[PDB]
Amino acid sequence: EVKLEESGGGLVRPGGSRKLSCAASGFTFSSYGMQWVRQAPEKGLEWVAYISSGSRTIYYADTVKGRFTISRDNPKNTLFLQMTSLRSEDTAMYYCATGYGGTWFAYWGQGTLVTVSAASTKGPSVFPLAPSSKSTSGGTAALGCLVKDYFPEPVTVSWNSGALTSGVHTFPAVLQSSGLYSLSSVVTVPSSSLGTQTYICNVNHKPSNTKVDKKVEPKS
Amino acid sequence: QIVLSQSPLSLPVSLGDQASISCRSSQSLLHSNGNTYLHWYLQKPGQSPKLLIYKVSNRFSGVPDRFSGSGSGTDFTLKISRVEAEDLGVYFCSQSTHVPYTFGGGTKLEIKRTVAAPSVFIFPPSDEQLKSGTASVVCLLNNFYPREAKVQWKVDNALQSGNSQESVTEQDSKDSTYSLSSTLTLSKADYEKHKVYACEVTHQGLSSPVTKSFNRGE
Amino acid sequence: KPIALICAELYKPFQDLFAALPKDCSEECQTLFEDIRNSESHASAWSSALRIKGVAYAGFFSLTNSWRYIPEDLKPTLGMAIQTVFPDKFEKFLERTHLHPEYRDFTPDYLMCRSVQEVSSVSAVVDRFKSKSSEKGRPIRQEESRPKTESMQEDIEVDELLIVEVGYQTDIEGKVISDIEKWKGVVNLMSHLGIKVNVLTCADNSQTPRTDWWIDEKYVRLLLNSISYLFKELLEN
Ligand SMILES: [Mn+2]
């Protein structure tokens, strides 16, 4: 099975550097050109670099020329990307890819997220969005959590430790002008269940090693 | 650079129907070796891209035969013969004939469904947040289709600008609807100088714009 | 000293030379040495010595690189290499060379293609020249045709040529520069034909340290002890 596994992402301050790696398995890695592609959040794909199988030919996108270096260690089945003088516009998910016989992107990794920013890692403030008559329709009530002012991204929300998945909408984060992120997560439930059913939102933010379990109750 | 122009930007399509996506190249993609390096990818929401078609019309191994490509020179098309719910996501053409390798901006395949009006709910700021000196008011548009919607805030009937942000889910894989949150953020002080907090929602599924509101102290 | 006494003083160093040259090369260098022995003027002898200098170097260049020495007359022109290697494009070659017909007759020291002599790998040759140029500061110039901004491809092999220009002269920079300037037009012509060619040019002189030439050190001692001493004794006397 062809697989590509990227590593090395994380938080980096503007002007800083990072080295990304991609472990290749399931094919003779040494015979094939290797590529890096990136995707800024909520944007399209943007090709980054190519390296021939024997490293004789290397291509760069103009945006990264003079700052990024692609390279490979064929005995180690590993592809690299040295990133330097990073800018916030480099904030992206970085994928390694290969054609396994051509210059098209046949095989992709799961990607690794690079965040370039001077904002400081902060776990989220979690506030309940309480069910009420203003959030009810028929026999259905909406409730949720506001997950405010955390950094950098991935945060994960679950409801009742993941037992509650029907009707859950966790919204994509919005980058605030403070440099921090915020989102909300809502769920609709039977309004008859209020008073009897405990609703707890579980906010996990691994970058700050913070985990928040907020209980959402109807207010009085 | 070679510019790839995709049309349409978004392609609402009913289950079972055919879909066609166009990709136009700003220069011929015919390589001097005789091949044409125009390729088609699908990116399902929250996943990494998948190759569908390489060199114009070659279907990648494992790819369902409902996908096909054709064209030459500067004009290329991807056909989905019979759309499936799984085919939801963004479709990119890309070329590797010329350095830099480039992508089109993507076509968002949208599954058609019957019109659904949004359920509109409003959430006053929690007491926990008000103690921290800020008030966020959340307005929620739940389970609506199509996506076009207009949401505005009015505090004591005065339109608000510059103090709200909005976020939309991807199209739901099960019921094909969208949800949208809009968050108005006031300082606690500004929040305590007003009474009526209202969210006005326009959507083609509503007989008229809906104003969901609350009075602060209640 | 009489020309015929210079040849005698350097009969052994020129036998060691002719003994190491490719068969067709040493036969040429031998005919020229005789003309120099029977030279009736310091002019004609110089002109003969000049031709030995270049011919003997080109043979030691073929030796070091394990290529074939092809006497000038038997060397292919640019038109002959495309005719035979890119026949589907020779007609368009001729059409695009109406205002520059001289391009067709260009005749490098080595006109090779990848499996007109054949070479295992064109990219390998270019890497060796670029390596020595970077490690030893040896002036080279290199040009690769490239239609538009086309990328290399991994799914198909293309036929490709390699054009090499060598030289043994005091002005190493001027040669690499003037060589690469003569091929620029054709390089841009191949680009417009979709033909992949690589032009390499280098040069050595006698002040170049013996371990840093484009020919094996042994060949260097063979040329300095013979063609160089000659030039010394040819002017002085
Ligand atoms: Mn020459």
XYZ file of C-alpha atoms and ligand atoms in Angstrom, chain C residues 108-109 164-167 169 175 179, ligand 1:
10
model
C 31.147 20.545 -32.182
C 33.960 18.446 -30.792
C 30.414 19.505 -26.197
C 33.145 22.024 -27.083
C 36.653 21.458 -25.744
C 39.805 23.517 -26.074
C 44.251 27.620 -25.202
C 36.623 30.299 -25.291
C 31.508 28.973 -27.621
Mn 36.842 22.864 -29.884
